[PDB]
Amino acid sequence: LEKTKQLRLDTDQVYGNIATYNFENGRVRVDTGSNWSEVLPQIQETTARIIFNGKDLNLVERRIAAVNPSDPLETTKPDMTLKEALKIAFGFNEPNGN
Amino acid sequence: LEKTKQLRLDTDQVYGNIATYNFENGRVRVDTGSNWSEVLPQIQETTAR
Amino acid sequence: IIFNGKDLNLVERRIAAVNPSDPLETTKPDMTLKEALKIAFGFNEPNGN
Amino acid sequence: KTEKEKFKDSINNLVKTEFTNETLDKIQQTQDLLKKIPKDVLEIYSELGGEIYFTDIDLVEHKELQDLSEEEKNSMNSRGEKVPFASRFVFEKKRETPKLIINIKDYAINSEQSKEVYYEIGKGISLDIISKDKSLDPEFLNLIKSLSDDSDSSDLLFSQKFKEKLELNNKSI
Amino acid sequence: TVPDRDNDGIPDSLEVEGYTVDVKNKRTFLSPWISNIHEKKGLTKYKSSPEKWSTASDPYSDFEKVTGRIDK
Amino acid sequence: TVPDRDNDGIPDSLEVEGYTVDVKNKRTFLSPWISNIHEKKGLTKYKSSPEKWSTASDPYSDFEKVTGRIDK
Amino acid sequence: TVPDRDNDGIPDSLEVEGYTVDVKNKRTFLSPWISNIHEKKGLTKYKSSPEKWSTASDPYSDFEKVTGRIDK
Ligand SMILES: [Ca+2]
Ligand SMILES: [Ca+2]
Ligand SMILES: [Ca+2]
Ligand SMILES: [Ca+2]
Ligand SMILES: [Ca+2]
Ligand SMILES: [Ca+2]
Numbered sequence: 020l021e022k023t024k025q026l027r028l029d030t031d032q033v034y035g036n037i038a039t040y041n042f043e044n045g046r047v048r049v050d051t052g053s054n055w056s057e058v059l060p061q062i063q064e065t066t067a068r069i070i071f072n073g074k075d076l077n078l079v080e081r082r083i084a085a086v087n088p089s090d091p092l093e094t095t096k097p098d099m100t101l102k103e104a105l106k107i108a109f110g111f112n113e114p115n116g117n
Numbered sequence: 118l119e120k121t122k123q124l125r126l127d128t129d130q131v132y133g134n135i136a137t138y139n140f141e142n143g144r145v146r147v148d149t150g151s152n153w154s155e156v157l158p159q160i161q162e163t164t165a166r
Numbered sequence: 167i168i169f170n171g172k173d174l175n176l177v178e179r180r181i182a183a184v185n186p187s188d189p190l191e192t193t194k195p196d197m198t199l200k201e202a203l204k205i206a207f208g209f210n211e212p213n214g215n
Numbered sequence: 216k217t218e219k220e221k222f223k224d225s226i227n228n229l230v231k232t233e234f235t236n237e238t239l240d241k242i243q244q245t246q247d248l249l250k251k252i253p254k255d256v257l258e259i260y261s262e263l264g265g266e267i268y269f270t271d272i273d274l275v276e277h278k279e280l281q282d283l284s285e286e287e288k289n290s291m292n293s294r295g296e297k298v299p300f301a302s303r304f305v306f307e308k309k310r311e312t313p314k315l316i317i318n319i320k321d322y323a324i325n326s327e328q329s330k331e332v333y334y335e336i337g338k339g340i341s342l343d344i345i346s347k348d349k350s351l352d353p354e355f356l357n358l359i360k361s362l363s364d365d366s367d368s369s370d371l372l373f374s375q376k377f378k379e380k381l382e383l384n385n386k387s388i
Numbered sequence: 389t390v391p392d393r394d395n396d397g398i399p400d401s402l403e404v405e406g407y408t409v410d411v412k413n414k415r416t417f418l419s420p421w422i423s424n425i426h427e428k429k430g431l432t433k434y435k436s437s438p439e440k441w442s443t444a445s446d447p448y449s450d451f452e453k454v455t456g457r458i459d460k
Numbered sequence: 461t462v463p464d465r466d467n468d469g470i471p472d473s474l475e476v477e478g479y480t481v482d483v484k485n486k487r488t489f490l491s492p493w494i495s496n497i498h499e500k501k502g503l504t505k506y507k508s509s510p511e512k513w514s515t516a517s518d519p520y521s522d523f524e525k526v527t528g529r530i531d532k
Numbered sequence: 533t534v535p536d537r538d539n540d541g542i543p544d545s546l547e548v549e550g551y552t553v554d555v556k557n558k559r560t561f562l563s564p565w566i567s568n569i570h571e572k573k574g575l576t577k578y579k580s581s582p583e584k585w586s587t588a589s590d591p592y593s594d595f596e597k598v599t600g601r602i603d604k
Contacts, residue, residue, distance in 0.1 A: 037447050040457050047459055053447075057136060057145050061445040064604040084437075084444045092600030095558045096443055097435040135591050136603050141395060142449070143441035145603050159589040162532035190456030193414045219467065226469050226523075228537065232462050234491045324485045326545035370568045393559070404558045438558055445604075486548045486582055487537065532589075 032056070065093060071109055081108040130154070169207055179206040238271065241319040245269050248322045248329055252336065259340050264312040269319050275301050279314060293334040295374050304328065305335045313339050360388075393439050397451040400438035407434055409454050416455060465510055469523040472510035479506050481526050488527060537583045541595040544582040551578055553598050560599055 020026060037058070038049045066082040083104045087093040105111045118124060135156065136147045170176050181202045185191035203209040234240075249267075260267070274280055287308075288300040304318040315335065322329050346352060362368040363381060370378065381387050390399040398407065398418065406421035408431045419426070421433045436450040437443040443450055452458045462471045470479070470490065478493030480503040491498075493505045508522040509515040515522055524530045534543040542551065542562060550565035552575045565577045580587040580594045587594055596602045 038459050039447060040452055040459065042457075045457075053144075053146065057147055058445070058447055061145060061604050065445050082444070090600040091553045091555055091560045091598070092439060094555050095439045095560065096437040097558075137591065138596055138601050138603065140601075143394065143445075143601070144447060156589070156591055159532050163589050188456040188460075189409050189411055189416050189454075192411050193416065195414075222469065225537070225539070228535065229488055229527075230470060230474075230490045231492075232471060232473065234494060237497060321484065324487065327549055367569060370572070371566065400559070439560060487544065488583060 067099070067104070069104065069108060073109075079109070083108055167202065167206065171207075177207070181206055238319075241321060242269065244322045244324075245317065245319045248332065252333070256336070256340060259343060260313070260315070260336070263339070263343065265339065266312065266314045268314070268316050270316055271319060274303055274306055274316060274318055277316060279308060279316065280306060283308065291374075293331050305332050307335055307339055309339065315339065394437070394441045394450075396441045396449040403436045403438040403450065405435075408432060409434075418455070466513045468513045468521040470508075475508045475510045475522070477507070479526075480504060481506075490523075490527075538581075538585045540585050540593045547580045547582040547594070549579075552576060562595075562599070 033055075035055050036049050036051055037053045037055060038047050040046075041048055062082060065084060065087065067085040068080065068082050070078050070080050072078045083099060084096050085099045085104075086096050131153075133153050134147050134149055135151055135153060136145050139146055167181060168176050168178050181197060182194055183197050183202075184194050204211075270277060289297045291297045292303075304320065306316050308314045308316070317332060320328055322332075344352075345355060362372065373381070390401070392399050394400070394403075402418075402420050407418060408421055408426050409416065409418050410426070410429065410431055411417065426433070434450075434454055441449055448458055462473065464471050474490075474492050479490060480493055480498055481488060481490055482498075482501070482503060483489065498505075506522075506526055513521050520530055535545075536542070537544055546562075546564050551562060552565050552570050553560055553562050554570065554573070554575060555561070570577075578594075578598055585594075586592060592602055
């Protein structure tokens with residue numbers, strides 16, 4: 020380590036909780052039994068991913084719920100087109116039909 | 118160990134929990150009370166491999 | 167809103183104002199900068215000033 | 216409280232407290248097949264001369280089916296395939312008095328055979344409800360007009376030979 | 389009553405065919421998409437899944453996201 | 461309702477004089493032992509104790525053992 | 533009502549003689565197997581056991597598997 024000066028630091032995983040709305044008193048309470056690792060492997064299998072770098076040349080990653088034709092619960096979501104997926108995730112528009 | 122350099126790594130068993138569908142709000146919640154060592158012997162006695 | 171008219175101490179308050187992009191937040195009443203100073207810092211008008 | 220009584224309804228159908236026979240089971244299982252069609256239907260059929268029997272003799276050597284024509288043995292079942300007569304178990308002989316002969320079976324455990332009885336019951340009471348003055352009811356004919364366009368009801372209710380005759384005329388009014 | 393299978397607080401005849409959220413005096417309403425009214429107000433037509441409590445499979449419902457009853 | 465002292469789901473008429481378990485199409489059935497009918501099918505005749513929830517005093521009931529609803 | 537010996541949400545007479553799951557407009561509907569409607573769309577004919585809550589003894593129901601309400 021004193022010769023080559025090579026030492027990096029990886030990130031294998033991240034633990035952390037989810038805070039959900041309380042309809043009783045309108046508050047937001049962290050549920051310490053639910054972590055984000057039960058949710059991210061369900062977002063990553065039922066959504067499409069689009070990476071775009073038109074804001075200050077930095078990569079912004081967004082996920083959009085699209086339809087899987089081999090899962091009967093997933094064929095209930097509405098149809099997602101590539102134009103509409105850009106218009107709601109990043110903020111495109113069409114001021115002159117383009 | 119310096120001479121023969123023979124060292125290996127057995128895997129005797131594996132702990133780990135199960136995640137079930139919650140019919141109320143559709144979420145999937147890991148139950149930390151039950152593991153796969155209750156389930157896996159039930160599969161190896163009823164199924165053909 | 168920060169304010170230091172009391173012997174140069176940065177007294178800090180926070181007054182609930184309306185976000186126009188969130189349908190729960192638009193239910194909060196209309197807040198003006200004259201009223202916001204009058205209720206959080208003890209400003210007053212005794213004869214219109 | 217209710218947990219030990221949530222267990223007793225999971226074993227409501229396993230434990231038979233008195234069993235005592237094998238053919239008395241099929242008698243009590245054929246009757247409650249037949250008393251879940253409503254009461255108004257069962258007098259419609261007897262009005263036309265309807266004699267409904269339960270037999271244990273299979274319908275090859277039954278005395279009221281030893282003599283019939285070579286096409287009366289061949290009518291299509293609930294599917295549409297005309298079946299060999301030695302393997303049928305429900306028949307209606309209707310030449311001057313409609314007689315519905317039902318071979319008894321375990322009819323609550325079985326649900327394919329429980330539907331080939333209700334199809335034959337409604338076969339007999341069809342010609343009453345289908346027509347008013349020996350002419351087709353426009354209460355019903357407007358339904359066949361509405362069900363012929365949907366691509367699911369057309370191959371659910373209608374036959375395959377009916378699918379090549381209705382749209383061949385392409386408006387068979 | 390109205391059929392709501394996914395239990396999220398919005399009827400299934402509204403999720404399939406379109407809905408929106410708009411306040412009138414100081415109260416939140418959730419009306420079906422009337423084309424001749426809601427377009428000129430600058431509103432947004434939503435559609436979502438009538439049998440999922442959360443269409444994106446993330447822990448905020450289709451009712452909490454569109455109403456602001458969410459982690460801010 | 462038919463008596464069951466030990467709460468093991470099987471009545472005290474059957475546990476003393478005999479019972480047997482057989483599937484009919486794909487559903488199990490618990491029935492009293494009738495000699496001429498059941499013997500030619502090669503079934504086994506069981507007798508147990510109507511006072512004990514488990515006759516061998518091991519943590520599996522007499523109903524769980526003969527049916528198969530047990531640890532495999 | 534309908535009989536259900538295992539309480540998985542699917543009746544006994546469907547687990548034995550075939551069933552399939554079909555979406556109609558945007559809603560899933562479990563239905564018995566009809567060879568004229570369901571062969572046309574390429575759907576699968578499922579069969580399972582009417583007295584196990586899970587047929588292969590894994591911790592997922594027969595109804596959770598074929599519908600899609602399952603860990604993805
Ligand atoms: Ca809903
Ligand atoms: Ca929804
Ligand atoms: Ca007992
Ligand atoms: Ca006992
Ligand atoms: Ca079942
Ligand atoms: Ca089952």
